[PDB]
Write a structure and sequence with these properties.
The structure is cut from a larger assembly and holds chains A and B.
Chain A (H helix, E strand, L loop, with lengths): L17 H8 L13 H14 L1
Chain B lengths: L3 E12 L2 E12 L4 E12 L10 E6 L9 E8 L1 H36 L2 H9 L5 H6 L4 H4 L4 H27 L1 H10 L3 H13 L1
Parallel strand pairs in B: 3-5
Antiparallel strand pairs in B: 1-2, 1-4, 2-3, 4-5
The chains are: A mainly alpha, B alpha+beta.
The structure holds magnesium ion (24 copies).
Chain A binds 2 RNA strands through helix 1 and helix 2.
Subcellular location (chain A): Mitochondrion
Organism (chain A): Saccharomyces cerevisiae (strain ATCC 204508 / S288c)
Family (chain A): Belongs to the mitochondrion-specific ribosomal protein mS26 family.
RNA sequence: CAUAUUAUUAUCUUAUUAUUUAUAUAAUAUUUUUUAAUAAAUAUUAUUAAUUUAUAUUUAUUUAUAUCAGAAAUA
RNA sequence: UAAGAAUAUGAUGUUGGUUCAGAUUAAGCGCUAAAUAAGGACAUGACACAUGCGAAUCAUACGUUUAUUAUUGAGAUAAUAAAUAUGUGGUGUAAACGUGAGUAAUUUUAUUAGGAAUUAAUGAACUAUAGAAUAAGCUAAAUACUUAAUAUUAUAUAAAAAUAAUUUAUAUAAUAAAAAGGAUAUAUAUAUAUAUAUUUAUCUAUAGUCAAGCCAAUAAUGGUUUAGGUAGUAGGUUUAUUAAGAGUUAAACCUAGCCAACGAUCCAUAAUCGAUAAUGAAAGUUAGAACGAUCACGUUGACUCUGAAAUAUAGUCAAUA
């Protein structure tokens, strides 16, 4: 029997699902588009480049 | 994985749920160019208090459990400590039983000497009765009464010598003429030498 | 024998702070019972403001413990 | 890729110390000294410090103040220009820089392809997506402060197995915790509101980055002419506190342990290390100035607030000047 307040087994290894990691870390805009303004365009270009990378 | 060590329980029963485990590791001492054993004593948690001094146990790393306790017994590899306690307990009764038995035997032998020769032989030989014959009975016959132990020893010794010499002679004879040994091997059922000796030894 | 620094305490003193009992016609808000000056329509009815009252949050007061640091003693 | 030499002895061989030949420096000193390129520069008093600088910035947060035009009659409001940070606000100073006093391991350093308590409904500040951004009160006003509105864990049911626990899914319970507006355009209507937008801000949630807290193993100077040390001491069981284990800190109860001649405890001394420097044939030894890494401190001590993280170069109290 292991100590009273301890865990018998080492913690459960949590493997990475790369599809889910991408889905949550970098999700694309679910709205189709907005496509107005200037800084908005700059930000859209930057965001798509960052996501692609 | 967790740090694991193999060690000997060197002190148990002096602390509640804690034992002392002596572990050894291989180190290289460059000052003397030698592979040495580095020794250490660990205070180790023992839930259930199952370990005893002299057990070989595997200790595993845990969370800090006290100021100095960071390991717990994970498995009893060898349990000589428990066996020692078992034999300690058993010998107490085991010894005392035959200690009383042989004291009884000593007292009985003393009494036999207490209530206890040539006169009897004189009476048996001359009267060959005046109320003494049955009195002797209560204790061809002169010989069997005078029967030393050495004679049985000599008979047994001659029997032993005869058995050994006959076995060796028969073995040598069978190993000499090797047709009849085959006859006997198929009668009773380089290994053939050992099997032949087996059959000859059971033969007598 | 004299001077100096460091540590310790069944000792004394102790800023500050944190806990800790107990006290406030102690305050500021909400709750009452009431007393005051305004309002409006036609005896008021409501507002703002004090009295008493009982829950929070603070201050003052102390009780107890610990505590920078000193003093005395010991090393 | 390992070399020896001089000096004993009347002479010899041997022991044995002393010294020398080589390289070097965080170097000083004596004598001397042309130019250029590069690398460094208080090792001592963490001794005391004159003077000047090293952390400001934002006016598109809120307030002020002027000048012209327009309408209104000392002023009021718009539009356009400006000035204002000695008023309220925000962000920025836990970093970097310097220093080596303390620190010999109770939280320090180094290493490991080490762990769990299975480190919190924590983001500090940028990504990627989403959704929000509501009322009063208080200040002169506000993106300043208050109050209010709205937005993982514990249970139980099963499932499995990386199993004598964890993980998964579900259903509840509470989560239940915020905010912020400015600058420009226009579009409506009746200067007033409003509706959109373009800007840059605010808040919340998820994931990612960057990061924090704790523990283990091994190693880390001299003196035992410091030999016994230790009573929270060693261990057990609870409670409190913490995101989190543990005599870590506080309280209670127990057991009688724990360390130590392979060196405890005590004392002294010292920042530590490298793919850094020196040296050597090499093992090693030395340094820890420079380059880099880590720690500690910012006149001395303790405590507290804020904060994810501070006994902070902050604040409080005291000491010193
Ligand atoms: Mg314990
Ligand atoms: Mg001489
Ligand atoms: Mg020389
Ligand atoms: Mg230069
Ligand atoms: Mg200096
Ligand atoms: Mg130095
Ligand atoms: Mg302005
Ligand atoms: Mg200002
Ligand atoms: Mg700093
Ligand atoms: Mg530095
Ligand atoms: Mg130092
Ligand atoms: Mg407002
Ligand atoms: Mg705000
Ligand atoms: Mg302790
Ligand atoms: Mg505890
Ligand atoms: Mg206690
Ligand atoms: Mg010692
Ligand atoms: Mg020093
Ligand atoms: Mg050194
Ligand atoms: Mg350096
Ligand atoms: Mg320097
Ligand atoms: Mg400091
Ligand atoms: Mg100074
Ligand atoms: Mg200080």
């Amino acid at each position: 029997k292991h100590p009273k307040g301890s865990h018998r087994l080492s913690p459960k290894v949590n493997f990475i699902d790369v599809d889910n990691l991408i889905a949550k870390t970098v999700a694309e805009p679910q709205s189709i588009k907005s496509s107005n303004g200037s800084a908005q365009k700059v930000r859209l270009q930057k965001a798509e480049l960052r996501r692609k990378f | 994985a967790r740090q694991n060590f193999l060690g000997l329980v060197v002190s148990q029963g002096k602390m509640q749920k804690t034992v002392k485990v002596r572990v050894e590791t291989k180190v290289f001492n460059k000052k003397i160019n030698k592979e040495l054993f580095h020794r250490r004593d660990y205070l180790v948690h023992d839930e259930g208090e199952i370990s005893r001094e002299g057990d070989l146990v595997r200790i595993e790393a845990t969370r800090p459990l006290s100021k100095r306790k960071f390991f717990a017994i994970a498995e009893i590899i060898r349990n000589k400590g428990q066996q020692f306690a078992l034999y300690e307990s058993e010998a107490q009764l085991s010894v005392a039983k035959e200690e009383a038995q042989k004291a009884k035997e000593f007292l009985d032998k003393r009494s036999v000497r207490e209530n206890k020769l040539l006169r009897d032989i004189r009476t048996i030989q001359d009267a060959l009765t005046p109320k003494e014959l049955l009195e002797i009975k209560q204790r061809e016959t002169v010989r069997q009464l005078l029967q030393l132990d050495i004679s049985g020893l000599e008979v047994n010794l001659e029997k032993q010598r005869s058995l050994i010499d006959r076995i060796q002679t028969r073995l040598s004879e069978l190993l000499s003429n090797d047709l009849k040994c085959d006859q006997f091997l198929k009668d009773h059922g380089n290994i053939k030498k050992n099997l032949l000796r087996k059959h000859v030894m059971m033969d007598m």
